[PDB]
Amino acid sequence: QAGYDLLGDGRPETLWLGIGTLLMLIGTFYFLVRGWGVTDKDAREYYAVTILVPGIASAAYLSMFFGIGLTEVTVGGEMLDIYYARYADWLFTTPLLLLDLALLAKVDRVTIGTLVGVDALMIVTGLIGALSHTAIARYSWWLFSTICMIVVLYFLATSLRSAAKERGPEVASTFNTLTALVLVLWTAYPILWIIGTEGAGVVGLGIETLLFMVLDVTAKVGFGFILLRSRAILGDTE
Numbered sequence: 362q363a364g365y366d367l368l369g370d371g372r373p374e375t376l377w378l379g380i381g382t383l384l385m386l387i388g389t390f391y392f393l394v395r396g397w398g399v400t401d402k403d404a405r406e407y408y409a410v411t412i413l414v415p416g417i418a419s420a421a422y423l424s425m426f427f428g429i430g431l432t433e434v435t436v437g438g439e440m441l442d443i444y445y446a447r448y449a450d451w452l453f454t455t456p457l458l459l460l461d462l463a464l465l466a467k468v469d470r471v472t473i474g475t476l477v478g479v480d481a482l483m484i485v486t487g488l489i490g491a492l493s494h495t496a497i498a499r500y501s502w503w504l505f506s507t508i509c510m511i512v513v514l515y516f517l518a519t520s521l522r523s524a525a526k527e528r529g530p531e532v533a534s535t536f537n538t539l540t541a542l543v544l545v546l547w548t549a550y551p552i553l554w555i556i557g558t559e560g561a562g563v564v565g566l567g568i569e570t571l572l573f574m575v576l577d578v579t580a581k582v583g584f585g586f587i588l589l590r591s592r593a594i595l596g597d598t599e
């Protein structure tokens with residue numbers, strides 16, 4: 362795989378996991394330090410939610426870097442590497458990102474429950490796809506998981522967007538900027554999975570790990586930088 366076997370254990374993808382670990386850790390500490398001076402009760406909630414996103418991802422990347430939670434899955438005569446920590450990371454961090462958006466839009470708890478429930482289902486069925494032993498099963502789960510993602514993104518772009526507009530231009534402009542980023546960046550994840558080792562196998566584990574790392578840092582640290590710079594986080598939350 363494209364990369365460099367940093368720990369001398371046969372895994373060139375640790376170069377990218379290590380860089381990912383460091384960027385997530387720096388993002389976490391930067392948010393933490395800037396949050397210590399925040400006193401507004403609403404801004405403190407956004408900070409609390411948002412620091413945990415790269416913070417949890419830091420733990421997951423450190424675990425992958427050291428090889429904890431790595432195993433192999435046999436599909437016919439090939440053996441695919443599966444890092445479990447990647448899916449546990451996304452299981453926790455994607456609801457937290459969705460919670461940031463839902464706080465900005467100020468939508469009700471049943472809407473939030475639907476959004477995070479479909480999101481959880483997306484991650485779980487992706488994991489089932491990653492562990493499945495026939496190509497037909499792996500592509501079928503991927504398709505179902507992708508449908509779940511489309512549902513989540515549809516709700517953001519319609520119901521939450523409409524709610525956010527009623528909160529005024531600072532909230533609506535921040536919501537719209539973050540949602541523009543999410544609609545593009547989250548969609549990149551199923552594309553990479555199906556062209557990478559889990560799917561068609563055009564891209565190998567090295568390039569795949571590099572690109573997931575770039576997506577992850579952007580989706581977590583980049584997202585948080587745009588959010589936490591905005592005056593919208595001072596507005597009332599429920």
Ligand SMILES: *C\C=C(C)/C=C/C=C(C)/C=C/C1=C(C)CCCC1(C)C
Nearest residue numbers: 487503506507510547550551554580
């Ligand atoms: C770490 C932060 C984020 C926003 C991670 C997002 C991950 C996804 C949107 C993954 C989606 C998948 C789909 C829709 C299909 C099955 C395979 C995936 C789990 C990669």
Ligand SMILES: CCCCCCCCCCCCCCCC(=O)O
Nearest residue numbers: 511514515518519544545548549552
């Ligand atoms: C390589 C980048 C590809 C990006 C493709 C982005 C397509 C996102 C589609 C998600 C569903 C959008 C739901 C409706 C959105 C809207 O009403 O504007």
Ligand SMILES: CCCCCCCCCCCCCCCC(=O)O
Nearest residue numbers: 384538578579582583584586587590
């Ligand atoms: C360590 C982060 C690397 C990846 C970061 C990708 C996203 C760039 C973040 C800088 C955004 C610049 C300031 C906010 C811009 C805006 O409001 O849209």
Ligand SMILES: CCCCCCCCCCCCCCCC
Nearest residue numbers: 364365376380384574575578579
């Ligand atoms: C002989 C090993 C040298 C390997 C050099 C790695 C490529 C340069 C590092 C660039 C990593 C950029 C990551 C993107 C950050 C979002």
Ligand SMILES: CCCCCCCCC
Nearest residue numbers: 495497498499501502505
């Ligand atoms: C031959 C295996 C079929 C895989 C199960 C179907 C998954 C339903 C979405």
Ligand SMILES: [Ca+2]
Nearest residue numbers: 401403595596
């Ligand atoms: Ca306030």
Ligand SMILES: [Cl-]
Nearest residue numbers: 399400401404
């Ligand atoms: Cl403040």
Ligand SMILES: [Cl-]
Nearest residue numbers: 400401402403
């Ligand atoms: Cl206050």
Ligand SMILES: [Cl-]
Nearest residue numbers: 363565567568
């Ligand atoms: Cl590769």
Ligand SMILES: [Mg+2]
Nearest residue numbers: 403597598599
């Ligand atoms: Mg309130």
Ligand code: NA
Nearest residue numbers: 366367368375
């Ligand atoms: Na290594």
